[PDB]
Structure formats: structure tokens, C-alpha cells
Amino acid sequence: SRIPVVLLACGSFNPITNMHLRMFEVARDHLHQTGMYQVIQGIISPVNDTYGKKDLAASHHRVAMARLALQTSDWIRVDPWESEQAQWMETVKVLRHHHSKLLRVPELKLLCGADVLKTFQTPNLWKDAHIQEIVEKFGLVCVGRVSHDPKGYIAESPILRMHQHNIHLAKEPVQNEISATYIRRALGQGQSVKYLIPDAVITYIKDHGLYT
Amino acid sequence: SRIPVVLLACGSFNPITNMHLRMFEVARDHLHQTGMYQVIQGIISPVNDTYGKKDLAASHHRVAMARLALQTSDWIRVDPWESEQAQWMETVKVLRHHHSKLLRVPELKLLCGADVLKTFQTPNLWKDAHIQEIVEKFGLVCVGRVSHDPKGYIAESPILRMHQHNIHLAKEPVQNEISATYIRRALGQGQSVKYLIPDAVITYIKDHGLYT
Amino acid sequence: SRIPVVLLACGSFNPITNMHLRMFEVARDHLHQTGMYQVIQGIISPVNDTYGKKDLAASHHRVAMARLALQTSDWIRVDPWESEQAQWMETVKVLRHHHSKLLAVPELKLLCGADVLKTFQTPNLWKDAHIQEIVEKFGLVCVGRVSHDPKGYIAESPILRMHQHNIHLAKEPVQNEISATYIRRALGQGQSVKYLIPDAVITYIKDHGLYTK
Amino acid sequence: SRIPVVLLACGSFNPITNMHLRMFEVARDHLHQTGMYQVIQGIISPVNDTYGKKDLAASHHRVAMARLALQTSDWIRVDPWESEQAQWMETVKVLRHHHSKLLAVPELKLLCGADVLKTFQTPNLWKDAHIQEIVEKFGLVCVGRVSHDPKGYIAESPILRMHQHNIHLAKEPVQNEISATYIRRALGQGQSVKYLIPDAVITYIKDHGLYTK
Numbered sequence: 001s002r003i004p005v006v007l008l009a010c011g012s013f014n015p016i017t018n019m020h021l022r023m024f025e026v027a028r029d030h031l032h033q034t035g036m037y038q039v040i041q042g043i044i045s046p047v048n049d050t051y052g053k054k055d056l057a058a059s060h061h062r063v064a065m066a067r068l069a070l071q072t073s074d075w076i077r078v079d080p081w082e083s084e085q086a087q088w089m090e091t092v093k094v095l096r097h098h099h100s101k102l103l104r105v106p107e108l109k110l111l112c113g114a115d116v117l118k119t120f121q122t123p124n125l126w127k128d129a130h131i132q133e134i135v136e137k138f139g140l141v142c143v144g145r146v147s148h149d150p151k152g153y154i155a156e157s158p159i160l161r162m163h164q165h166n167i168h169l170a171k172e173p174v175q176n177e178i179s180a181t182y183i184r185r186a187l188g189q190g191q192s193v194k195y196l197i198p199d200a201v202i203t204y205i206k207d208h209g210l211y212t
Numbered sequence: 213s214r215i216p217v218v219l220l221a222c223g224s225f226n227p228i229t230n231m232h233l234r235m236f237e238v239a240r241d242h243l244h245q246t247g248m249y250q251v252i253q254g255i256i257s258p259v260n261d262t263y264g265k266k267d268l269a270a271s272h273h274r275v276a277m278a279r280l281a282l283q284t285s286d287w288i289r290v291d292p293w294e295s296e297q298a299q300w301m302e303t304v305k306v307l308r309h310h311h312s313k314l315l316r317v318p319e320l321k322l323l324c325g326a327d328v329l330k331t332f333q334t335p336n337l338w339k340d341a342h343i344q345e346i347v348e349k350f351g352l353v354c355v356g357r358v359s360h361d362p363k364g365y366i367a368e369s370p371i372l373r374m375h376q377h378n379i380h381l382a383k384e385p386v387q388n389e390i391s392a393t394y395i396r397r398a399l400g401q402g403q404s405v406k407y408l409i410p411d412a413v414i415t416y417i418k419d420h421g422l423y424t
Numbered sequence: 425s426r427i428p429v430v431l432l433a434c435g436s437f438n439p440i441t442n443m444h445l446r447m448f449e450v451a452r453d454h455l456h457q458t459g460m461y462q463v464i465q466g467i468i469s470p471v472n473d474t475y476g477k478k479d480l481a482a483s484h485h486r487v488a489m490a491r492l493a494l495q496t497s498d499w500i501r502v503d504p505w506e507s508e509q510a511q512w513m514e515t516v517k518v519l520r521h522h523h524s525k526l527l528a529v530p531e532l533k534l535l536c537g538a539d540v541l542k543t544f545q546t547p548n549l550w551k552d553a554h555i556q557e558i559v560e561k562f563g564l565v566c567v568g569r570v571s572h573d574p575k576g577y578i579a580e581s582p583i584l585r586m587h588q589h590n591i592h593l594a595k596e597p598v599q600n601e602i603s604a605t606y607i608r609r610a611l612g613q614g615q616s617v618k619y620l621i622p623d624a625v626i627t628y629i630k631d632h633g634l635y636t637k
Numbered sequence: 638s639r640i641p642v643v644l645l646a647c648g649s650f651n652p653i654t655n656m657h658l659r660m661f662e663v664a665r666d667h668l669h670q671t672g673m674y675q676v677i678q679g680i681i682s683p684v685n686d687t688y689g690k691k692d693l694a695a696s697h698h699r700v701a702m703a704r705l706a707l708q709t710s711d712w713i714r715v716d717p718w719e720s721e722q723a724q725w726m727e728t729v730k731v732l733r734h735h736h737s738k739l740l741a742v743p744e745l746k747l748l749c750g751a752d753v754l755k756t757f758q759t760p761n762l763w764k765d766a767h768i769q770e771i772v773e774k775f776g777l778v779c780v781g782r783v784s785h786d787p788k789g790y791i792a793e794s795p796i797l798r799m800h801q802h803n804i805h806l807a808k809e810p811v812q813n814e815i816s817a818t819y820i821r822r823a824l825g826q827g828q829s830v831k832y833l834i835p836d837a838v839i840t841y842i843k844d845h846g847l848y849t850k
């Protein structure tokens with residue numbers, strides 16, 4: 001039988017966009033395609049407000065937009081836990097938390113774009129022990145992104161190359177490179193972002209005067 | 213004051229996708245950005261079933277999906293006229309028809325991707341007289357597409373370069389290259405196309421067993 | 425053992441670019457990776473000056489630029505036969521010509537971008553009989569292009585689908601999407617196209633004053 | 638008249654690619670087009686071997702490959718000073734070094750991809766003081782990269798926004814998106830990278846057996 005899988009996406013979702021959503025669909029089809037897994041749930045987990053040097057919309061807003069974006073999904077949901085904690089938390093700790101919840105078994109895997117594998121290379125950004133735990137205790141499902149060569153990132157990482165069994169590379173045949181940075185800039189200039197992010201999210205943004 | 217403009221998109225819409233929809237939004241912002249026009253209406257006109265060597269879903273279905281896709285739009289509508297004619301019609305004739313309807317004045321402009329300008333170069337595909345009428349009597353609003361250099365197409369076309377005043381090039385800052393061919397193949401393989409085309413269109417496709 | 429293969433690319437080469445050259449390399453690696461072919465030669469065949477609606481530099485120059493571009497290739501050569509004819513010739517006839525020239529005979533395959541498969545769908549552009557002969561008697565090696573879905577083009581064409589075993593799809597992960605149209609526009613404006621097309625080609629264009637506004 | 642400008646690119650160049658070289662050309666044309674600058678030189682400065690978590694070919698080799706790649710450039714040269722130091726050096730210090738070497742003094746600007754602007758946002762990666770000095774005292778010329786929105790990076794950074802006049806954004810319409818990571822993987826698998834990186838660089842890699850699995 002198939003191994004039940006839950007996919008967790010940790011990010012800013014400032015705001016959530018059609019690309020972020022498409023990432024889950026592609027990842028699920030890829031896992032199902034292997035014949036060994038049954039994706040049963042997707043979880044969007046917006047980062048806490050204390051994170052970064054950037055000016056993120058308040059977490060309750062990012063969580064609300066994600067929920068709106070996901071109303072039409074029958075398998076992906078937003079979980080505010082991470083954003084409700086007092087402070088930012090390294091991603092492995094969010095994985096640990098959700099793994100436990102599953103117990104109160106399906107495998108919990110981190111879902112990210114190929115761009116994330118490249119960030120693993122950034123000095124001091126991710127503790128080696130954490131990278132190892134992500135691919136050894138949990139799993140990593142990576143969706144392609146223009147300009148990134150995931151197979152090379154893996155081959156060149158002493159840690160990743162030793163845990164390839166837990167790394168799933170899903171190819172994105174579609175050229176959908178929507179940048180949330182671009183979304184925010186366009187919104188700020190009064191330009192349309194319709195068809196780039198969900199309609200309900202656009203309405204929410206207008207209603208709450210976000211990204212002005 | 214601003215010149216009222218109506219944008220007409222002639223295509224297969226087999227099925228209509230988020231890229232096709234995004235094309236209108238980008239074109240409108242670009243025209244408004246110039247300061248000289250006020251886009252008042254967008255029209256999607258699905259091609260007639262007698263067109264091509266391809267197997268297109270029946271026109272009533274393509275028209276229905278476009279209408280569903282456009283329910284959330286307050287300015288773009290589908291007009292079945294072209295698809296309801298007995299036979300295929302060169303595009304200039306569809307422009308003429310809609311121009312007349314406007315009379316029962318706003319300028320009517322053809323909306324297309326940069327890829328269309330390249331098709332103007334195909335031997336025997338578009339009558340020179342027709343290309344001329346499109347850019348001289350009406351107008352052409354072109355939205356960028358990867359791999360295409362619209363400025364070069366114009367510069368190299370004896371006809372286009374003489375009517376640059378009626379050609380508006382709108383740059384697509386977003387990497388959204390969704391191919392309807394890809395959409396059909398994925399649907400045929402049972403893969404998700406969610407977030408690539410409107411939810412209501414996906415439901416319609418399933419309900420009517422299209423693209424199997 | 426392996427089936428010997430010669431790759432033929434028919435196109436404007438106005439001018440030849442690093443992307444046109446890259447296609448040969450990607451196609452060769454792909455065929456070798458299947459383990460059943462051995463590519464022994466590549467042929468660049470510039471189209472006749474009588475062809476199409478667009479303006480082309482003289483074939484004399486396009487053949488020259490291809491020759492210069494290929495000086496550092498040990499397996500690809502330019503063949504001016506097609507452009508030396510009195511008039512344009514349908515691609516199937518160029519394939520036939522080069523096949524006869526080969527006459528244990530290596531297989532001759534047409535090398536093209538995935539966008540060519542789409543053009544097969546254009547009314548009146550290619551004779552069905554020709555499309556069939558091209559895929560059946562010669563074969564196609566298609567290199568992917570942003571925005572095109574070759575697999576779908578194949579599936580939606582009865583002719584291509586029936587002979588899909590003779591259509592080899594290669595994937596070049598690198599964007600490239602360098603269009604010769606862009607190259608010509610840049611040149612006309614006095615901008616650099618270095619590292620987009622071969623240094624030797626730029627020298628020829630400059631020396632002979634080509635592609636000026 | 639025009640302000641003389643020298644462009645400095647700091648990076649791995651592991652190995653240098655046609656895309657890295659193309660960035661210099663695109664950046665020069667952009668600055669010239671503003672009508673107020675005249676680019677007089679480009680400098681490729683390979684990073685020190687002590688840098689980062691990834692494995693780099695020896696700087697001896699990266700400097701060599703850059704020199705070979707640049708033999709056909711009449712304005713870009715490789716400068717090994719940075720890689721010859723005992724240890725890695727923050728980019729601002731390399732800029733300071735090259736500025737002193739210039740000492741009517743031409744302006745020295747850091748040439749980079751738009752993705753570098755994003756990295757400025759990484760906690761602990763660049764000192765705010767350094768980011769400020771880089772944009773204020775030297776300047777940045779950023780060449781666009783698929784997936785990145787430089788204008789947004791600038792607007793969302795107080796430091797960059799305040800000195801945005803010293804950040805020059807150039808647009809290369811051509812995809813390219815050739816990553817050195819891909820180049821290294823292809824080489825390791827014995828695939829061709831011809832027309833993606835300079836012929837002279839491929840010869841050196843082959844002669845010295847670099848980038849093997």
C-alpha cells in the first residue's frame with residue numbers, strides 16, 4: 001500500500017500567490033506518480049512577524065488571505081500555529097511541531113521551490129544539523145524554478161547527496177514565475193494582479209488597504 | 213479626454229487559461245498608463261469549429277468555459293458571434309463585425325500575444341491587405357511572450373513599421389507561459405491544472421468529459 | 425552496435441547564433457544517451473534567398489558566417505547546396521538530397537526546435553505527405569523551447585503520433601531563448617551581441633557592414 | 638562629458654560562463670545609453686578558496702579560465718588579487734582595494750545579477766554599513782534575472798531606496814538562465830557545455846581534468 005504523506009510549506013506568503021498554490025498540486029501529482037505515496041494533506045504555514053529585515057503584512061492578514069485562497073481546495077489548509085508563536089522559529093522546529101500533531105502514521109515532508117536548496121548553501125543561514133534532520137527525519141519535495149538546478153545542488157551538498165531517497169524532485173513543466181515582490185510592487189502602483197493571485201485575496205487586500 | 217477603447221481577443225480558447233485572462237489585464241494597464249486611452253470593454257471571441265487541422269472542443273463548450281472564466285470580471289465578456297457563424301472567418305472580418313456593432317465612438321483594437329506578430333510572417337497565412345487593415349483601420353495591442361521580440365517583428369515588417377502609432381507593446385513583467393496544449397495534455401493524463409485555469413472551467417471540463 | 429546518424433538543420437541562420445549551435449550539441453548528447461545512436465556529423469543548411477516574407481542577409485553571407493562559426497566544431501559543417509539552388513526548396517527535398525549524398529547507410533534526421541512541430545499544424549504550410557516522409561523516412565530531433573509543449577503537439581497530430589518513435593525529444597534545461605530577431609535588432613542599434621553569437625560571426629558582420637538599420 | 642566607469646564583478650566563476658560575460662556587455666551598453674557614463678574597463682575577480690560551503694575548483698584554475706575566456710575581450714580582464722589573499726574578504730573591501738588602485742578618478746561600480754539585491758535581505762549576510770557604502774560610494778549595476786524583481790527589492794529596502802540613483806538596472810531580454818551549477822553537473826556527466834561557456838574554457842577544463850564526478 002501507499003505511504004500517507006502530508007506536505008508542509010513554510011514561507012512568508014506575503015501574499016500567497018497562484019504559484020505557491022500550484023506548487024502543492026505539482027508536488028502531489030509527482031508523489032502520486034511515483035506509485036509509492038498518497039498525499040493526504042497540504043499545510044501552508046505563514047512565517048511569524050518577527051522574521052526578517054522585510055516589512056511583511058501582519059500575520060493575521062497573511063493567514064486570512066491564505067485561508068481565502070484555499071477555500072476552493074479540498075486538501076490544502078493554512079495552519080496559523082507558527083505565526084502565533086511569540087517569535088520566529090527555525091523551520092525544523094515547525095516540522096517537529098506538526099509531526100507531533102500528526103500523533104496527537106503519515107510521513108511529513110517539507111515542500112519548497114528549488115530556490116530553497118540554494119539557500120542551504122548560504123553561510124550561517126541553515127544549521128547543517130537542521131538540513132540533515134529535514135532530509136533524514138522528514139523529507140523534502142522540491143518543485144523546479146527557473147534558473148535553478150536542483151540536481152546539482154543536491155550533488156554538491158555533502159548532506160543532501162547522502163539522503164536522496166528522501167528528496168523528491170518534481171518538474172514544473174509550466175513557465176509560471178510569479179514573484180510576490182512583483183505582486184506587492186504592482187499593487188502599490190495600482191496595477192492589476194488579477195489572474196496572478198486568487199480573486200478573494202485581491203478583494204481582501206483592497207478591503208484592508210494592504211500593500212499600499 | 214481619453215479615447216475609449218475596446219479590446220478584442222480572437223483565438224481558440226481551448227480552453228481559456230489564466231494566461232489568456234492575464235493578457236487583458238496587462239493590456240488595459242498598459243493603455244491606461246499611456247494616459248491617452250480608457251479601456252471600456254474586453255471581448256473574447258472563440259474561433260469557429262471549422263478552423264484548423266486541430267481537434268478543438270465544440271465551440272459551445274469553449275464559449276461556456278470562457279463565460280465561466282469571466283464571471284469574476286467586470287469588464288471582459290465572451291461574444292459567441294464568430295463561433296456561431298457557418299464557417300471560419302479571417303480575423304479582420306471579425307474586427308469589422310464588432311466595429312459595426314459598436315455603432316449599432318470607441319476605438320476597436322485587436323489584442324494578441326507577441327507570438328501573433330511572428331505568424332504574420334508565415335507565407336500565405338495572413339493577407340498583406342489584412343495585416344495593413346488591422347493596424348491602420350483598427351489597432352494592435354501586443355503582450356510580450358518569452359522567446360519573442362515584438363520590436364524586431366515590427367521593424368522588419370514593411371507594413372507594421374509604417375503604422376507604429378496604432379501598435380501598442382505591453383511588457384509582461386511576469387514569467388507566465390501557460391500553454392493550452394500543455395493544459396490539454398495534463399488533463400488527458402489526469403494531472404492537475406488547478407491554479408493554471410479558473411476553477412469553474414476545471415469543473416466544467418470534468419462535468420462534460422472534455423479533453424480526455 | 426549504434427546506428428550512425430547525421431543531423432541536418434534547415435533554417436535562416438540570419439545570423440547563426442550560439443543557440444542554433446547549442447541545439448546540435450544538446451541533440452547529439454540526447455541521441456547518444458539513448459544508447460542506440462552515434463552522431464557522426466551535423467549539417468547547417470541556410471535557406472534560399474527567395475524564401476519567405478522577411479528580409480534575409482545574402483545567402484553568401486549566411487553561409488560564410490556559419491562556416492566561420494563552425495571553425496571550432498569538429499563535427500558540424502555548413503553545406504550551401506540548398507541556398508545555391510535557383511529557388512527555395514521544401515525541406516523534404518533537401519533531406520532527400522542530403523540522404524542521396526550519403527549513399528550500412530547512416531540515418532539522416534532533421535534537427536529543429538519544438539516550435540517547428542507547431543508549424544506543422546499551419547494550414548497549407550507543410551504537405552501532409554511531406555510531414556509523413558520527414559518523420560517516417562528521416563526522423564526528427566526536437567530541442568525544447570520555452571512556451572512549447574512538443575509532447576502535446578505529437579499527441580494531437582495523427583501523423584506524428586503514429587510515427588512518434590522517430591521523433592526524439594531533447595531537453596536543454598538552459599533558457600537561452602536568444603532569438604535571431606533580437607540579435608538583428610541589437611546589431612542595428614549598435615548594441616553588443618557578444619557571448620550571444622560567436623566572436624567570429626561578429627567580426628564578419630562588422631567587416632562586411634551587415635544588419636545595419 | 639562622460640563619467641569614466643570601471644565595472645567589477647565578484648563571484649565564484651566556477652567556471653566563468655557565457656552568461657557571466659554577457660552581463661558585462663549588457664551593463665556597459667546600459668550605462669552608455671544613459672549618456673552620462675563611459676565604461677573603460679571590466680574586472681572579473683574570482684572569490685577566495687576559503688569562501689562558503691560549496692566546493693570550488695582551485696582559484697588558480699578559476700583565474701586561469703577567466704584569463705582564457707577574456708582573451709577575446711578588449712576591455713574586460715581578470716584580477717586575481719582577491720583570490721591571492723590569505724582569506725576571503727567582504728566585497729566592500731575588494732571594492733576599496735580596486736578603487737585605491739585607480740587613484741578625475743573613474744567611478745568603480747559593482748556588477749551583479751538582480752538576485753544579489755535579494756541576498757542583501759538575508760540576516761547576517763551583509764553588514765548594513767557595507768550595503769550602504771557599496772551603493773553610496775561605489776554604485777551597483779544590476780542585470781536582470783528571471784524570477785527576480787529588482788525594482789521591488791530596491792523599494793523595500795530603506796538603504797537601497799535612499800540611494801537608488803546609484804543603482805543602475807539593465808535589462809537583457811534574452812533568457813540565458815545558464816547556471817554554473819548546471820554547467821558543472823553537465824561536465825561531470827560527460828555532456829557538452831559548448832556554446833554555453835567559452836571554447837577556451839572547455840579546453841582548459843579538459844586539459845586539467847576539472848569538474849569530474
Ligand SMILES: NC(=O)c1ccc[n+]([C@@H]2O[C@H](COP(=O)(O)O)[C@@H](O)[C@H]2O)c1
Pocket residue numbers: 010011012047051052089090091092125126127130
Ligand atoms: N535556518 C532556518 O531554519 C531557516 C533559514 C532561512 C529561512 N527559513 C524559513 O524558510 C522561509 C524563508 O523565507 P524567505 O526566503 O522569505 O526569508 C521562511 O519560512 C523561513 O522561516 C528557515
Ligand SMILES: NC(=O)c1ccc[n+]([C@@H]2O[C@H](COP(=O)(O)O)[C@@H](O)[C@H]2O)c1
Pocket residue numbers: 222223224259263264301302303304337338339342
Ligand atoms: N488570415 C487570418 O485572418 C488568420 C490567420 C491565422 C490565424 N487567424 C486567427 O488568429 C487565431 C489563431 O489561432 P491559432 O494560432 O490556434 O491557429 C484564430 O482566431 C484564427 O482565426 C487569422
Ligand SMILES: NC(=O)c1ccc[n+]([C@@H]2O[C@H](COP(=O)(O)O)[C@@H](O)[C@H]2O)c1
Pocket residue numbers: 434435436471475476513514515516549550551554
Ligand atoms: N513545407 C516545407 O517544406 C516548409 C514549410 C515551412 C518552413 N520550412 C523550412 O523551415 C526552415 C525555417 O523556416 P521559417 O523561417 O519560416 O520558420 C526553412 O528551412 C524553411 O525552408 C519548410
Ligand SMILES: NC(=O)c1ccc[n+]([C@@H]2O[C@H](COP(=O)(O)O)[C@@H](O)[C@H]2O)c1
Pocket residue numbers: 647648649684688689726727728729762763764767
Ligand atoms: N558581506 C559580503 O561582503 C558578502 C556576502 C555574501 C556574498 N558576497 C560575495 O558575493 C559573491 C558571490 O557570493 P555567492 O556565491 O555566495 O552568491 C562573492 O564575491 C562573495 O564574496 C559578499
